[PDB]
Amino acid sequence: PDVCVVQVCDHMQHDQGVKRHALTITYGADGFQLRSLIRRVRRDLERQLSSTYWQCYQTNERAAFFVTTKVANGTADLLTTSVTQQLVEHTESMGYSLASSYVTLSPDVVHTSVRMLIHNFTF
Amino acid sequence: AAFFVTTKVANGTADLLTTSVTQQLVEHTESMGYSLASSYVTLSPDVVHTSVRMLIHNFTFRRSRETIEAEPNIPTMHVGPRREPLNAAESIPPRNERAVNIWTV
Amino acid sequence: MKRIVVPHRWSEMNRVEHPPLMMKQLFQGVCGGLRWLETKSLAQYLAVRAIEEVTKQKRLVSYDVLDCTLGSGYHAGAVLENGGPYTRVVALDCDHDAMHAARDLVEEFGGDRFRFYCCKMSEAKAMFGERSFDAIMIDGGVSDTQLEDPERGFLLDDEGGHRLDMRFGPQMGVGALEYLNTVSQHTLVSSLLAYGLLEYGQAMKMSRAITRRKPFVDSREVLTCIEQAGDELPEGGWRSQGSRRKSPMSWKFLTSLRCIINNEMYELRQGIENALLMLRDDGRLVVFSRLPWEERLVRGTVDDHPHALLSYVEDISIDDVQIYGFTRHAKMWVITRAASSAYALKNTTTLTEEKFRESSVRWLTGMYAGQTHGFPANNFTFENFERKEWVTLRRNGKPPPVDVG
Amino acid sequence: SPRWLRNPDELCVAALRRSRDVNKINSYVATYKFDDPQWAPLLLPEVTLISHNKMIMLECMSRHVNFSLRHIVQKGHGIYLIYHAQHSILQPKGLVEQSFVTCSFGIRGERLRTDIVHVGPIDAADVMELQPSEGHDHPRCCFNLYQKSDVRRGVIAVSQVEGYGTWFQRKPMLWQRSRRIGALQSQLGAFAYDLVDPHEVGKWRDCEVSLLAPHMRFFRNGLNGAEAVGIIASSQVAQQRRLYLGEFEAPAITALDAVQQLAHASALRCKLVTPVVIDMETLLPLSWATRTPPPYVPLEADLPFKLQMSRPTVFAAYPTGGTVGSPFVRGAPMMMFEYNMHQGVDHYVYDDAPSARPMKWWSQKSNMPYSGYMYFARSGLVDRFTPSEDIPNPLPTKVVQERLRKYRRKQQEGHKQ
Amino acid sequence: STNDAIGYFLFRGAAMYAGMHRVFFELSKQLPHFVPKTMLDFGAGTGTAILVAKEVYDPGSLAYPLYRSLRQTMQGNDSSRTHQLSELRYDLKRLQRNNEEKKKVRFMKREIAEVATAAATAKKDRLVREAHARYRDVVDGTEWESGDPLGEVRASTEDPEDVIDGEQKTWWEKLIDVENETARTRAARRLRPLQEVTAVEPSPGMMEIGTMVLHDDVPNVTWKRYLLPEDEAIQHDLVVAAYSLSEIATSENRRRIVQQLWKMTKGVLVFVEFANLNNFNILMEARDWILEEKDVGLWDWQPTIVAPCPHEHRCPLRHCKTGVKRKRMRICSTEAHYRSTFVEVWARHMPLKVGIEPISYLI
Amino acid sequence: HKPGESGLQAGSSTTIAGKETWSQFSTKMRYGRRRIRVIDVAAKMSYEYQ
Amino acid sequence: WAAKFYGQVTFGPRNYPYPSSRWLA
Amino acid sequence: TFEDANNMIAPNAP
Ligand SMILES: C[S@+](CC[C@H](N)C(=O)[O-])C[C@H]1O[C@@H](n2cnc3c(N)ncnc32)[C@H](O)[C@@H]1O
Ligand SMILES: C[S@@+](CC[C@H](N)C(=O)[O-])C[C@H]1O[C@@H](n2cnc3c(N)ncnc32)[C@H](O)[C@@H]1O
Ligand code: SF4
């Protein structure tokens, strides 16, 4: 497509004091090669962290999953930015260019079973 | 206005469904000669005693400038077994009443 | 010059067909017997005569088979393919979606060799008469085409949850989800005990869990409750190769419920009984059994019917179990309708001294009596027409005039 | 290229063929997968810049044949486990083409005894074709297996195994094993992991040696037996193309290789084979038996085990017997080794308090993965002896008429319609 | 259980059949033009209601013929009247002496061919009665046509006689109309009687017996195990609760069940019960509950009592003065007479050649 | 019960081989008496006709 | 003759004089 | 993954 939408939903949970979060990337269209993005993210994160603490694979066509179970604050901040950097760079390299990006979070001052960070890219 | 719903389904599946819906929305509105100028999203807290959340998502577009399928507006949900034969939909004229082709191909 | 096309659904696009099971064995058991040999000898006699050389036009030679359960046309197609020109099949699946397979069989073979009706097997005797088919084949249970379908509700692990309406054809009413939402604990326990798989204590536990955690929105919640009551469902989903007794209560409960909302016990019982009446003398009936209650019912019915005698039983080949993933317990029961009384042959092996003594006591006490004097009883007779009744048939063709009354 | 790990599900044998004779229903003919280069080194003799070794392939073939035949005794049982593998070679030289398998219930109605008779060339030199299209400095060799009349054949080996086909006992096989691997891992620090030079140990390369030199002890210079601590390292197995490994356990071949190896070392110490101080004289096994008593725990690979041997008795009435398991050859001297190996920590206890039962939970036992005996012959006297005894070599019209009659009827009737 | 259901059907089979006939007789006479295309049973233990409804609204679709000379066979329906006329023409042919000179021909004017086609169709409908099995034609050795092996085009073929309004007397003319049978057959085809019927029976044994009872005579009956509250969305032409309200459990809400039954009725809802004090109280409470619907909704849908009550006020027998002291003057029941079967004759020490079935009913 | 003889004509034969027990005879009679005598059509006239 | 319907009575109104079964004969 | 656990030691060719 001449315009593509990329949805990156980060679901944050925690039980018994161990906080985890799972990123889900989804593309609007099918023509994108997502095994390459998974490859690039693996290459760029094997250096930053051990695989015991994170895991990224392909759920199906044009959708990718990336969990992190036990990650410190600074390390989680590293992981998020690295994944976003690789996503944007891969999509732009495929022959696209980023037009707009915008995000939202659940305020939920009270305890909430899930927190959601919805990031939207337009290419 | 239009409507779309899903049932309790894995988070990745729900994300796929919504991403596809928005991708098709943008493609359809751009087919009319509109280029997506701006957009944004907002997620509200969950209701006090319930896990229901509300997500308000806005797009703004600026104006830039064969086989048909039968489909009822309101769909019919499909329980396991069919309640009518497979061919029940089709109506076919009497074989004697049928006539010869006027066109070709 | 536009074409009208109904959009395909995901189920229509991604449907898969049931694999063939015991092809050669079923063919040997169904196109085999006294009827088969006599048909072949009739073909010989006709070929010899052919070398020598408004009214209902009859077939010179044909072998009639009924398929009480045609899913994919693999079994109904084997009898027509490995058979010859002198073969005919009538299929009676209960699901309207089996016409998809029936259409392929009609396209491949003749329209004069195949017929299809959307009905349950128990009504075969109602839709036909006694002594109508040379062969009958029953393959109960569920077809693989229905397992994966998100709409049929047989699908397991189902990330998200569906409507658990796992029933065969529209001829049944409430599906499993609302059956579990409405049924009573005692009713569920009594219904489950009818199949033997689930012992009284286990049935009580499972029904207690269901009744306590109603109502159920969908399959994921139903399965959560079933998981809590009992062990995790085994790998391989519905088809588990483990032993019957050691299989988990969750799997046994799911199988029992799947049978309960399809009346499989009554359906199979009446299918076997009706087949033993609508089959021809020394005709052949084959029935597939995959559950202990099915095996028990087949054994008892054949041992008690005063015309049925079990020819033999064939298990499933491990090669087929490996390649197509069938349950290793699947066996084939070929039954034959003895022309005479089969008890003279069965007592050869089943007759005890206690049975002999109770038989003598029954004769002495006149327990073997029936009813012949009574309003409905006086109007009944054996199969052969009576002398007084041939007159009724000959007389209800033209009545006489009468002046008074 | 390597497959140093192999799941137990896969076997080295192709589909077996039951014999049609009414009295030979138990008889099957086995054809082994020579085509696969994976099993090619394991199912064909190794070539030295020949070794005559057979335990690398004889044991594998017998065990996998029994694994294939397990189904007729498994009865749907949870687990199937093989044991009591006896082998006796009638001719040390020559490779194998096929085998005949006769299966019975043995004694118990819960086990399955087998009898394997191997038939093939009794001389590998004739089939050898050296340096066929070497190309690179290292040529790739090939064997002509099925030959019309250029090869003389006969029985080469006779073996027998038996599988138990039983259930998974939770206690002896789940949470006692769970504790034993942990104890061995904790004990891992007690040993010194220094390998030994293979020249005095019988192997050619230092990559296929699993016998810790600092923990090899001999009594009266090995004249009364020997002990040795060894480790079947995944590192050693990976870059060694002969043997493979499981998910966690070590197969019987890679367990018996260490026995052969320590036997070679003890033979050097006892003056039974000529050392290197040139060509290497690796003693070869003629007949050997290996059993696993209950609980039939496998030999864990990544954790060390201590092997123990008896003094070599040199035979100029065998102590075992005349049946399968004892040598079926006579002539040059042989060397007998009784061996038992321990894999576990029997000396670790944790006595939290007398009131509880510390021994019923935290006690354990150094299991015996493989025990048995081996008969070896010096590599130089392979051709000195000949097989002693003699064993024989295991070497539609009416249906057509009926079918043609049927076709006659069908094609005749086709016209009338 | 199944044995209890067997005994219930044997002992109460004939009496319930008699009661259902006694009710459907009045229903057919009072609403002659009613024809239940679609039917529902609440608590169809043995399908006696289905059997009687089939017998009255479609006497020519049964496996066996009905007894012609019986007063029970003279119904006021339109379909029953069509079948009665068809059968009566036979007796008229009997009354007159005709030439009966058939014209048997062989292979060697077109009126002969068309009359032969009509006679072939008559034989086709004849064999269904004779063999007590539809589709009996195919099991013959006769060749099968290659036209409709699956019968898809027959079912999907548009009828050219059913047409919407826009899409396009004297005794002699009446006699000609009645003599012409093609119009009668077209009227029968226009009136599909009891084409789809659903029967509700939670009890597994009773459901098992009812399936067996009904399979031979009424084809394609949908058996539900339970009546869901969400099932109001579908209304049927006829809804019968025969001897069920009394056996509804006390834990369940009988008012809710009855309101659901009325709200899912596209027609002539029929309650039937045995004449008893408790059953009569139940039936009168139901009468009041449905009659509470008079002051709500479209007038063309509100309930009316077509029988037996001519008034829509309180029952004067339920509020009689004598009934307080006398238990006889409390039930506004009616009586059915039948030939008692040997099961009842054995269960009683009397011969009882004529058994009596008292019933209270409400249409 | 010998199959040849009737149910009330109790047989005098003492053999065992060609005999079926009386429970089996009862089951056979139940499975055999499953037909209706044909209903006279011309014998009795229609109620509407009368 | 009557107690054989005890296995048919539903669990609720099965032990009406005693709202429990553990302490039941 | 188990194969990912073995790949650190060495690769296998199935
Ligand atoms: C005993 S009668 C059965 C025969 C039927 N009344 C007839 O005349 O043909 C009443 C039936 O109503 C059913 N029933 C009882 N309570 C019910 C309920 N709450 N909902 C639906 N059916 C019920 C029972 O299964 C019972 O078989
Ligand atoms: C196991 S599949 C048969 C597949 C195919 N005949 C074969 O063996 O390759 C059984 C089919 O019979 C149908 N069936 C189940 N119960 C039936 C019944 N009582 N009457 C008619 N069909 C039934 C199901 O819809 C299902 O598709
Ligand atoms: S039941 Fe009888 S008394 Fe009561 S309202 Fe009806 S007709 Fe009147």
- Report chain B residues whose CB lies below 8 A from the CB of C99: 85-87
E257: its two tokens? 């069940």
Residue D67 region by backbone torsions, left for phi larger than 0, else alpha for psi between -120 and 50, else beta: alpha
- F13 touching chain C per CB within 8 A: no
What are the φ/ψ torsions at residue H4 (nearest 5 degrees)? -65, -25
- 8 A C-beta contact, residue E109 and residue E66: no
- 8 A C-beta contact, residue E303 and residue E291: yes
Relative to the alpha carbon of C76, which ligand is closest? 2
Is E243's C-beta closer than 6 angstroms to any atom of ligand 1? yes
Determine the residue of chain E that is closest to G10 in CA distance: E249
Testing ligand 3's pocket by substitution, the residue of E284, E312, E332 carrying the most ligand atoms inside 8 A of its CB is: E332
Relative to the alpha carbon of E52, which ligand is closest? 1
Query: Closest ligand 2 atom, CA of C67?
Result: 6
C319 residue type, one letter = D
Using alpha carbons, list the distances in angstroms from residue E105 to A57, D316, E114: 83, 111, 14
Query: Closest ligand 1 atom, CA of E243?
Result: 6
E73: its two tokens? 């066979």
- 8 A C-beta contact, residue D225 and residue D219: yes
- 8 A C-beta contact, residue G12 and residue E251: yes
Is C72's C-beta closer than 6 angstroms to any atom of ligand 2? yes
With CA atoms as reference, report the closest residue to E283 among E234, E334, E233: E334
Residue C91: its H or E element: strand C87-91
CB atoms within 10 A of CB C33: 21
d(CA E35, CA E267): 10
Helix (H), strand (E), coil (C) string for chain D? CCCCECCCCCCCECCCEECCCHHHCCEEEEEECCCCCCCHHHHCCCCCCCCCCCHHHHHHHHHHHHHHHCHHHHCCCCECCEEEEEEEECCCCCCCCEEEEEEECCCCCCCEEEEEEEEEECCHHHHCCCCCCCCCCCCCCCCCCCCCCCCCEEEEEEEEEEECCECCCHHHHHHHHHHHHHHHHHHHHHCCCCCCCHHHCCCCCHHHCCCCHHHEEECCCCCCEEEEEECCCHHHHHCCCCCCECCCEECHHHHHHHHHHHHHHHHHHHCCCCCCCCCCCCCEEEEEEEECCCCCCCEECCCCEEEEEECCEEECCCCCCCCECECCEECCCEEEEEEEEEECCCCCCCCCCCCCCHHHHHCCCCECCCEEEEEEECHHHCCCCEECCCCCCCCCCHHHHHHHHHHHHHHHHHHHC
With CA atoms as reference, report the closest residue to E46 among E9, E78, E88, E94: E9
Up-side HSE of residue C155: CA atoms within 13 Å toward CB?
A: 19
- C125 touching chain F per CB within 8 A: no
For residue D369, is the peptide bond before it cis, meaning its omega torsion is within 30 degrees of 0?
Answer: no
Relative to the alpha carbon of E309, which ligand is closest? 3
Smallest Cβ distance to D413: which of C85, C242, C318?
C85
* Alpha helix ranges (H) inside C194-248: 200-212, 219-228
d(CA D91, CA D122): 7
Strand bridging mode A54-60 / A18-27? unpaired
Strand bridging mode A63-68 / B34-43? unpaired
- Report chain G residues whose CB lies below 8 A from the CB of E1: 8
Could F45 and E69 be called an inter-chain contact, meaning their C-beta atoms sit closer than 8 Å?
Answer: yes
Relative to the alpha carbon of E334, which ligand is closest? 3
E210 residue type, one letter = G
The nearest CA of chain E is from the CA of F38 a distance in Å of 9
d(CA D391, CA D156): 10
d(CA D151, CA D128): 11
D237 residue type, one letter = V
Cβ burial D195-230 (10 Å sphere, 16+ → b, else e)? bbebeebbbeeeebbbbbbebbebeeebeebbebbb
- Report chain H residues whose CB lies below 8 A from the CB of D234: 6, 9-10
CB atoms within 10 A of CB D232: 23
Residue C279: its H or E element: strand C279-289
What are the φ/ψ torsions at residue D266 (nearest 5 degrees)? -65, -30
d(CA C166, CA C146): 9
Cβ burial E10-35 (10 Å sphere, 16+ → b, else e)? eebbbbbbbbbbbbbbbbbeebeebb
DSSP SS3 for C74: helix
Residues whose CB is less than 8 angstroms from the CB of residue C68 and which lie 6 or more positions away in sequence, other chains included: C92, C121, C124, C136, C137, C138, C139, C271, C275
**Angle in degrees, 0-180, between the axes of helices E2-30 and E204-215, rounded to the nearest 10:** 60
Strand bridging mode D249-250 / D299-300? antiparallel
Q: Check the CA dihedral E125-E127-E132-E135 and report its sign.
A: negative
Could H12 and D235 be called an inter-chain contact, meaning their C-beta atoms sit closer than 8 Å?
Answer: no
Give CA G14 to chain center in angstroms: 3
- Report chain E residues whose CB lies below 8 A from the CB of C376: 341-342
DSSP SS3 for C286: strand
With CA atoms as reference, report the closest residue to A4 among D121, H6, B24: B24
d(CA E161, CA E191): 13
Taking only Cα atoms into account, the Rg of chain E, rounded to an integer number of angstroms, comes to: 24
- 8 A C-beta contact, residue C380 and residue F33: yes
Q: Check the CA dihedral E304-E310-E312-E314 and report its sign.
A: negative
d(CA B93, CA E132): 34
CB atoms within 10 A of CB E4: 14
With CA atoms as reference, report the closest residue to C198 among C126, C115, C256: C256
**Angle in degrees, 0-180, between the axes of helices E204-215 and C185-193, rounded to the nearest 10:** 60
d(CA C233, CA C358): 48
The nearest CA of chain E is from the CA of G22 a distance in Å of 24
**In E262-354, where do the E strands start and end?**
270-274, 334-338
Give CA C339 to chain center in angstroms: 22
d(CA C377, CA C356): 30
Is E48's C-beta closer than 6 angstroms to any atom of ligand 1? yes
- 8 A C-beta contact, residue C228 and residue C220: no
Determine the residue of chain G that is closest to C183 in CA distance: G10
- 8 A C-beta contact, residue D126 and residue D158: no
Smallest Cβ distance to F29: which of C359, C370, C389?
C370
With CA atoms as reference, report the closest residue to E357 among E67, E20, E6, E122: E20
Could E69 and F50 be called an inter-chain contact, meaning their C-beta atoms sit closer than 8 Å?
Answer: yes
**Partners for B (CB, 8 Å, 3+ pairs)?**
A, C, E
D140: its two tokens? 């790739």
Largest CA-CA distance found in chain C, in angstroms, rounded = 85
d(CA C101, CA C67): 13
Is C283's C-beta closer than 6 angstroms to any atom of ligand 2? no
The residue with tokens 């994170």 is A54
Testing ligand 1's pocket by substitution, the residue of E6, E203, E244 carrying the most ligand atoms inside 8 A of its CB is: E244
How many helices and strands (H and E) does chain F possess? Answer: 1, 1
Residue A19: its H or E element: strand A18-27
Instruction: Please give the resolution of this entry in Å, rounded to 1 decimal.
Output: 3.3
Is C69's C-beta closer than 6 angstroms to any atom of ligand 2? yes
- Report chain E residues whose CB lies below 8 A from the CB of B81: none
Preceding-residue numbers of gaps in chain D (C–N over 2.5 Å): 49, 277, 316, 395
C with F: touching (≥3 Cβ pairs within 8 Å): yes
- Interface of chain E toward chain G, CB-CB under 8 angstroms: 1, 4, 251
d(CA D343, CA D369): 7
Q: Dihedral, CA atoms, D339, D340, D342, D347, nearest 10 degrees?
A: -110
- Interface of chain E toward chain F, CB-CB under 8 angstroms: 64-65, 67-71, 73-74, 84, 87-88, 90-92, 94-95
